[PDB]
Amino acid sequence: RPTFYRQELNKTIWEVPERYQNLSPVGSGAYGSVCAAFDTKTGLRVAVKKLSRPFQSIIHAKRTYRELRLLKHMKHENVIGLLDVFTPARSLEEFNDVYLVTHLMGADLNNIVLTDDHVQFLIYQILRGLKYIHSADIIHRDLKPSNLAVNEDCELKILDFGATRWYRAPEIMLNWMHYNQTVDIWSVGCIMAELLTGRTLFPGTDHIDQLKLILRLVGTPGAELLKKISSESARNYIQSLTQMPKMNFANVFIGANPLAVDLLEKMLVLDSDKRITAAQALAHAYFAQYHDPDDEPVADPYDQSFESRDLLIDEWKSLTYDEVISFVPPP
Numbered sequence: 001r002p003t004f005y006r007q008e009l010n011k012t013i014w015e016v017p018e019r020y021q022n023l024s025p026v027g028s029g030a031y032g033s034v035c036a037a038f039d040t041k042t043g044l045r046v047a048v049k050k051l052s053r054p055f056q057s058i059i060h061a062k063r064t065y066r067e068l069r070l071l072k073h074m075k076h077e078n079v080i081g082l083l084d085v086f087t088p089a090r091s092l093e094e095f096n097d098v099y100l101v102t103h104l105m106g107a108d109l110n111n112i113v114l115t116d117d118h119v120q121f122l123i124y125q126i127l128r129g130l131k132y133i134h135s136a137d138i139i140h141r142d143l144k145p146s147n148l149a150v151n152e153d154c155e156l157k158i159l160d161f162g163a164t165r166w167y168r169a170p171e172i173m174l175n176w177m178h179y180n181q182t183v184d185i186w187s188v189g190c191i192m193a194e195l196l197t198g199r200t201l202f203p204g205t206d207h208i209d210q211l212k213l214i215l216r217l218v219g220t221p222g223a224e225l226l227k228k229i230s231s232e233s234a235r236n237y238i239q240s241l242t243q244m245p246k247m248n249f250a251n252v253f254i255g256a257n258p259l260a261v262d263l264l265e266k267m268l269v270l271d272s273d274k275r276i277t278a279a280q281a282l283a284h285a286y287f288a289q290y291h292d293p294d295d296e297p298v299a300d301p302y303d304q305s306f307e308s309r310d311l312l313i314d315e316w317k318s319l320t321y322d323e324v325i326s327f328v329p330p331p
């Protein structure tokens with residue numbers, strides 16, 4: 001066991017292994033605070049996150065176990081990955097705090113403020129990462145600029161901290177609960193549009209306004225789409241709106257790469273059943289300058305059967321403690 005060392009960075013107190021030097025608060029979340037740090041064992045600049053209330057309840061505990069399982073499984077250039085995970089506790093009895101460590105990226109996809117070149121490189125990496133995580137039956141469902149880490153080299157990694165509705169696919173707005181992975185593709189679509197344009201494509205004020213703005217572009221749902229909506233509530237809402245026609249994307253996005261406007265068409269389709277997938281998008285002619293089907297790997301199988309489990313805090317804690325102890329760092 002390494003020798004830890006304590007210190008206080010504002011309201012939050014930290015106790016980490018000597019290996020990590022010069023901690024600097026970088027921001028807070030409802031799930032923990034993060035500190036940029038120097039890992040002397042690797043010379044790398046890293047980010048260290050201390051989970052707020054690891055096991056405050058059944059939900060916090062389960063979430064904590066989830067946070068750990070996901071990050072330990074992610075091993076892709078365009079996805080956040082675990083460098084190290086540690087705890088001050090020498091036993092499960094004293095186990096109350098979790099610290100995750102990862103590569104320090106710097107700025108978010110928002111900060112960066114884009115030449116058609118960066119746009120196709122940027123979105124290309126998102127899709128490359130999305131293909132990977134999607135291949136493990138994992139849906140992000142919360143994709144947006146702030147959850148996209150980009151370095152000065154324009155390298156991108158998808159991640160999940162913790163607006164949002166501005167990027168949510170319509171079938172997750174209406175409160176539907178049988179949505180596929182392509183909800184993420186819709187977010188990509190919204191993000192891509194924001195880069196080529198410089199404006200958030202759908203700046204809605206609520207779940208209703210947001211849905212209106214969307215339809216204002218993609219148009220009202222036709223016979224085939226209304227036909228698949230279970231919720232009489234939702235169905236009656238949509239049908240009760242002044243019919244809206246689909247717009248010509250070539251017009252909406254004035255003078256943008258024509259190949260880029262075509263991909264936007266395929267990503268912002270209202271019916272999740274006909275929306276392009278991450279894998280299929282990596283092959284769109286728009287990414288011909290970067291696509292390489294030999295370097296767009298899928299993930300190893302991911303066991304998420306725990307997601308349907310209902311356990312006590314100590315069990316979710318025990319499972320999490322095992323996970324921290326069995327961790328094996330990357331090369």
Ligand SMILES: Cn1nc(C(C)(C)C)cc1NC(=O)Nc1ccc(Cl)cc1
Binds near residue numbers: 048070100160
């Ligand atoms: C909840 N979740 N989901 C994913 C994906 C789907 C991107 C693998 C990743 C995460 N979790 C995280 O991204 N967690 C995390 C940990 C440390 C820092 Cl500094 C920032 C973020």
